[PDB]
């Protein structure tokens, strides 16, 4: 085998495949790249045993097909270091890959392609497309609610639920919940499935700044996403998860709105004097007004008072402000609305412009 | 106790006086910020047990003295968090500090001023002016050479020597070093101050890049520095910085030129395939050329072929890529000229436009 590639085509893929690689992944082969020339293209790959990234790229200059396994992290970092428009000279001969670029010269650790865990081929079940920019909304509107480590494995990842023509997603840890949905414009079967944390990181990663169509195909127990020439593969898990319609509070009777930015800045401020581990505060609400106060073990005490649209009596309740500030960052609006039940049940929230991401977060017992 | 100040007037002082903060300060009130109204000005104080940062801000409304010390990062963020032109009104009622902003209210944990040590006022020896800009390059150009943790504690810091009509600074690891010399326009008596790394960190941060001129006073074992509105004060480490002229190389007879960006690029690239800790790269110089390689533990090999102007004798020499990249990252200039003596001496390294500075690593023989 031999190949030649154009830095700028291949640099972005390199960054795509390069990001997920853990400081130390489990099995050394996972530290190297899949380099296969099949037909007229190279496919580059890194895996964590649960996810996989592929980029397919046109080779304009002479080549012959083949297979190898070469060091990923350092390779990408080298390619960051390359000059604009770089012409690269690389070649398989037996158990060495020779890497030259321009007049620079390199000699590599090289393993066979077959020593790398070649991930699984499977049959498509459902296929569909969407804009990249809508997906980023869906993701970024929901991503932070996943736990870092929940052993209820069905928490660590993002739920995709397909029924009728709508695809609906959600993330949560028991303490926050966020949902985001847009319709796909095609009548689908039913497939619902949740993606692993690290899988979803990479999916985010591949949402480059383009309006180019993003396509994903789901199998029975695995999923693939094509966005043009940027390619994604991950297996899925059985993933029994709860029905989110049992998690939704049905109709919390009292309603509340308030201005997002004012809200957010005030939260920002008041939040700092809640204990950082508990994020503890009490919210007292009255007609046309909200009063915010806290204190922590350090015996710092807080108060913020502001303009809120609210009709009804007082209420007493407290939250993790990180959780809400994260929604407020995502929340791209002037007005948001809370629709409340009580201190021992959910609080539902909805963006006065979103109508797609509603939020229910648990408070404290004071 | 009274005063009134605007958000915009508090913001930058607060960030700057918030510099010394961190490291789980052992004497708890060191983790707090001192509010003092004294004479015609509001003074804030933060210490890290070795240094102090003072801010002077205009008190235009009526005020009265009285002072206390409130928890620092949290407190800085509150003030930073308020909107443009905000009503900030604080008042000491003995033991408690009550802080308000308009209709919002803030009541803090409060430790009295007298738990915070106030460090001794000291006597000046030498006093001077120059642009901040000059001082920014000066510190930045040597910062990286100071060790983070060395047992030779005196190297965790920077030698300031003023001499003749030149301001002359220098720092080191015990491995590598940069020294720099700038003309100041007036007579300076001979002086030495050795400032701990924390100190120079703080000094770096107080360069906000203004054209506000920089004026500084230095005592025997203390220091004073004025940037625009702000005034810095610290004590230093007592002694044992050796004579830097001792380590200076002895008339390097070999000259070496290569384009700075190019040069920098090749180094960056090459760094990635060396020993993780030791960054081992190999240099063979010859008429019109240099041979660059590194070998790393994973049997990997890089080599860069390059644009080298060279007149002098042929020799072999290798040294730690990280340390030299640090100088190359500081030298955003036209050319580097390197001046060599032999394969077993310290080497001199230069911007080909400024001999104001000198950079140096000794080699390892690998």
């Amino acid at each position: 085998m031999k190949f030649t590639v154009e830095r700028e085509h291949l640099l972005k893929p390199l960054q795509q495949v390069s990001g997920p690689l853990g400081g130390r992944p489990t099995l050394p082969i996972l530290g190297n790249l899949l380099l296969q020339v099949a037909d007229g293209t190279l496919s580059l790959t890194g895996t964590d045993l649960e996810m996989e990234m592929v980029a397919r790229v046109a080779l304009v200059q002479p080549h012959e097909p083949g297979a190898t396994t070469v060091p990923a992290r350092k390779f990408f970092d080298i390619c960051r270091g390359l000059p604009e428009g770089a012409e690269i000279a690389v070649q398989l001969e037996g158990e060495r890959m020779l890497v030259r670029s321009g007049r620079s010269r390199f000699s590599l650790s090289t393993l066979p392609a077959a020593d790398f865990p070649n991930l699984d081929d499977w049959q498509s079940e459902v296929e569909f497309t969407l804009p990249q920019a809508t997906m980023k909304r869906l993701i970024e509107a929901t991503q932070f609610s996943m736990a870092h480590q929940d052993v209820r494995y069905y928490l660590n990842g993002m739920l995709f639920e397909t029924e009728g023509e709508e695809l609906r997603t959600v993330a949560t840890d028991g303490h926050r919940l966020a949902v985001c949905s847009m319709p796909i414009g095609q009548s689908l079967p039913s497939h619902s499935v949740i993606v692993p944390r690290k899988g979803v990181i990479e999916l985010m990663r591949m949402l480059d700044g383009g309006d180019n169509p993003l396509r994903v195909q789901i199998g029975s127990n695995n999923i693939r996403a094509h966005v043009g020439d940027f390619i994604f593969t991950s297996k899925l898990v059985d993933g029994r998860f709860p029905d989110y319609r049992r998690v939704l509070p049905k109709n919390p009777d009292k309603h509340l709105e308030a201005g997002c930015d004012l809200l957010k800045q005030a939260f920002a401020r008041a939040a700092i004097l809640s204990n950082e581990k508990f994020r503890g505060v009490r919210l007292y609400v009255s007609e046309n007004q909200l009063k915010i106060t806290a204190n922590n073990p350090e015996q710092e005490e807080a108060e913020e008072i502001l303009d809120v649209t609210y009709s009804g009596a007082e209420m007493e309740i407290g939250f993790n402000v990180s959780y809400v500030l994260d929604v407020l960052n995502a929340l791209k609006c002037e007005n948001v609305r809370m629709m409340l039940t009580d201190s021992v049940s959910s609080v539902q929230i909805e963006d006065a412009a979103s109508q797609s991401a509603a939020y229910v977060v648990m408070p404290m017992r004071l | 106790m009274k005063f009134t100040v605007e958000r915009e007037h508090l913001l930058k002082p607060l960030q700057q006086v918030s510099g010394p903060l961190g490291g789980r300060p052992t004497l708890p009130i060191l983790g707090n910020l001192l509010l003092q109204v004294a004479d015609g000005t509001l003074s804030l104080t933060g210490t890290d047990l070795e240094m102090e940062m003072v801010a002077r801000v205009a008190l235009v409304q009526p005020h009265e003295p009285g002072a206390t010390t409130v928890p620092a990062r949290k407190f800085f963020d509150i003030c930073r968090g308020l909107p443009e032109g905000a009503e900030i009104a604080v008042q000491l009622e003995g033991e408690r500090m009550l802080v308000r902003s308009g209709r919002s209210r803030f009541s803090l944990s409060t430790l009295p001023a007298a738990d915070f040590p106030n460090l001794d006022d000291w006597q000046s020896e030498v006093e001077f002016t120059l642009p901040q800009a000059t001082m920014k390059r000066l510190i930045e150009a040597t910062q990286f050479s100071m060790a983070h943790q060395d047992v030779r504690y005196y190297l965790n810091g920077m030698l300031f020597e003023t001499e003749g009509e030149e301001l002359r600074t220098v720092a080191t690891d015990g491995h590598r070093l940069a020294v720099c010399s700038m003309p100041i326009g007036q007579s300076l008596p001979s002086h030495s101050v050795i400032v701990p790394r924390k100190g120079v960190i703080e000094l770096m941060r107080m360069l906000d890049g203004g054209d506000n001129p920089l004026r500084v006073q230095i005592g025997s074992n203390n220091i004073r520095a004025h940037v625009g509105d702000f005034i810095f004060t610290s004590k230093l480490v007592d002694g044992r910085f050796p004579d830097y002229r001792r380590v200076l190389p002895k008339n390097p007879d070999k000259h070496l030129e290569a384009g700075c960006d190019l040069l920098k690029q090749a180094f960056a690239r090459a760094a990635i395939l060396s020993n993780e800790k030791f960054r081992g790269v190999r240099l063979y110089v010859s008429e019109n050329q240099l041979k660059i390689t590194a070998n790393n533990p994973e049997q990997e090999e890089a080599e860069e072929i390059l644009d080298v102007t060279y007149s002098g004798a042929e020799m072999e020499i290798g040294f730690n890529v990280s340390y030299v990249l640090d100088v190359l990252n500081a030298l955003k200039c036209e050319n580097v000229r390197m001046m060599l003596t032999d394969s077993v001496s310290s080497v001199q390294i230069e911007d080909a436009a400024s001999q104001s500075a000198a950079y140096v690593v000794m080699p390892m023989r690998l």
Partner: protein, 229 residues
């Protein structure tokens, strides 16, 4: 030119003379010139004159019969001595080798002297101990410290360690040299020899009496007092 070895043999005596009843079998002959790896080995082997020690076997697993017909120490004593003559001998486990080297030179019975008379004897562990006092200064220890592969190389010792130990040696001497500061290294043996008015503060008549009474107690309770002798 600087030449080293750690040598694998017909096992060891664990007590006293670790060398007694043993002779050398293996030659990987390191040539390292200006701290660069030539790999210029003379590769033929020697006579065991005995069967394998059980300890030695478990460390490396070698067995006698491969190394028996290959010529003895006497046939390449001079060939190999010329290979090592006029050199720096920085070596690990010095007590073992030097013991053997010098000893084998005399055992030829051509009166060929001990190696320390024509070669510079240096222990590598002494220098390792100097650099890393109270750390493990072993081959595998420092191997892992300087990140060299002895995980894909099962042999302990010499047909591998030659190469490796060179890299180790280089690391230790090629660790990084130091910035000539002005420093004064303690262990300078001097005495003042002076005279000038100073005050002597004497004990009182009563203090003397307390002492004389104390010595009474020494003498009378003890049966003698050497002040009162």
């Amino acid at each position: 030119r600087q030449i080293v070895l750690d040598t694998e043999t017909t096992g060891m005596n664990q007590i006293g003379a670790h060398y007694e009843g043993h002779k050398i079998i293996e030659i990987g002959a390191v040539e390292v010139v200006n701290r660069r790896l030539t790999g210029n080995n003379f590769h033929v082997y020697l006579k065991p004159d005995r069967l394998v020690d059980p300890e030695a076997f478990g460390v490396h697993g070698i067995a006698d019969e491969f190394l028996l017909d290959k010529p003895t120490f006497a046939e390449v004593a001079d060939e190999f001595m010329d290979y090592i003559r006029g050199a720096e001998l920085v070596i690990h486990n010095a007590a073992f080798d030097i013991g053997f080297m010098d000893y084998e030179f005399s055992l030829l019975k051509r009166d060929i002297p001990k190696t320390n008379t024509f070669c510079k004897v240096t222990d590598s562990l002494a220098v390792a101990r100097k650099m890393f006092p109270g750390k493990r200064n072993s081959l595998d220890a420092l191997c892992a410290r300087y990140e060299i592969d002895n995980s894909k190389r099962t042999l302990h010792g010499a047909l591998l360690d030659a190469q490796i130990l060179a890299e180790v040696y280089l690391a230790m001497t090629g660790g990084q040299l130091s910035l000539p500061l002005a420093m004064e290294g303690e262990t300078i043996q001097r005495i003042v020899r002076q005279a000038s008015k100073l005050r002597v503060v004497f004990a009182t008549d009563e203090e003397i009496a307390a002492h004389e009474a104390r010595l009474d107690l020494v003498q009378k309770k003890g049966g003698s007092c050497l002040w009162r002798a």
